[PDB]
Design a protein around this ligand. Structure first.
Ligand SMILES: OCc1cc(-c2cccs2)on1
Ligand SMILES: OCc1cc(-c2cccs2)on1
Lengths: 167, 167
């Protein structure tokens, strides 16, 4: 709740379990990590007045997903933009000081209506925290590329589990 | 509409643009490809009586996403199970004989309520075609692992575009 911005090294540290500690929220490591930095995170503001994040991913033509999605027709997979949003919501829960490891629970409505091409420079994520409570967060999110809105998700859900070995 | 099952080599061929031809639907290539084989595909049956697919992905502990999602806590990303479903719906549109390249358009409701661990053997996807029409398909889908249902998506949408360079 005190630190409001995070560098890539912070996010890598988070992915090793070294930002929030043992048994607590982890971002994925590369190549599933879809965030380069969190430019702003707060527990106030956002469209519901219950917090928001602004985060970024730098684009260059050599990002691994362009070569295979699709051959001769490169475009960032929307599923990874969507996962960026789940990653960010999980991070928020950890940043709030909740214990447990993250699992995406799903989403209300997801829309893709624009492309991230390999000539793009920067993707920006906006996350609006709708509600926090098991421990879980509900949020809305939008992905943009170089100023243009391209993806949206309503009712993103992420949960924290102190146990996942007894299902 | 004539061939009702596809091997991994067929799906790799599809990813190179060589199953449906130039400017037509492509599956992603590895490592975004989340399908090993399509066990059954039909334009009849399914929960709406407008077609269905059954597909599989073999699991082993060395699949790339286990190491990074998450370090010390491996679990298949739900976003990739979800993408498997979009991949399959796009494939269906191509299999039906529609021209154009695929783009996921989004989804109605997504739920994750179970894990694919690295000790699992086989993930099975079921897709139920709800409606086909731009060219697009609406469908519902469920992901299962070794018999157990774990993810669901309502109102998966995928579209085909004969042009994506003029947005
Ligand atoms: O596969 C994800 C994806 C989908 C799209 C578009 C959807 C509609 C117009 S472009 O851009 N990226
Ligand atoms: O990060 C995605 C994911 C989430 C889950 C679970 C959700 C609820 C219980 S386990 O499995 N994979």
């Amino acid at each position: 709740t005190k630190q409001h911005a995070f560098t890539r090294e912070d996010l890598l540290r988070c992915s090793r379990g070294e930002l929030f500690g043992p048994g607590n929220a982890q971002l994925p490591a590369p190549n599933m990590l879809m965030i380069d930095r969190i430019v702003h995170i707060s527990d106030v503001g956002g469209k519901y007045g219950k917090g928001e994040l602004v985060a970024e991913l730098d684009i260059n033509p050599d990002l691994w997903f362009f070569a295979c999605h699709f051959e001769g027709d490169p475009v960032m997979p929307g599923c990874l933009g969507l996962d960026a949003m789940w990653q960010l919501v999980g991070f928020y829960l950890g940043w709030q000081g909740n214990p447990g490891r993250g699992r995406a629970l799903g989403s209300g409505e997801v829309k893709f209506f624009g492309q991230v091409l390999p000539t793009a420079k920067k993707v920006t994520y906006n996350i609006h925290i709708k509600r926090t409570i098991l421990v879980l967060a509900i949020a809305d999110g939008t992905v943009s590329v170089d100023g243009r809105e391209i993806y949206s998700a309503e009712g993103l859900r992420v949960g924290l589990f102190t146990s996942t070995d007894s299902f």
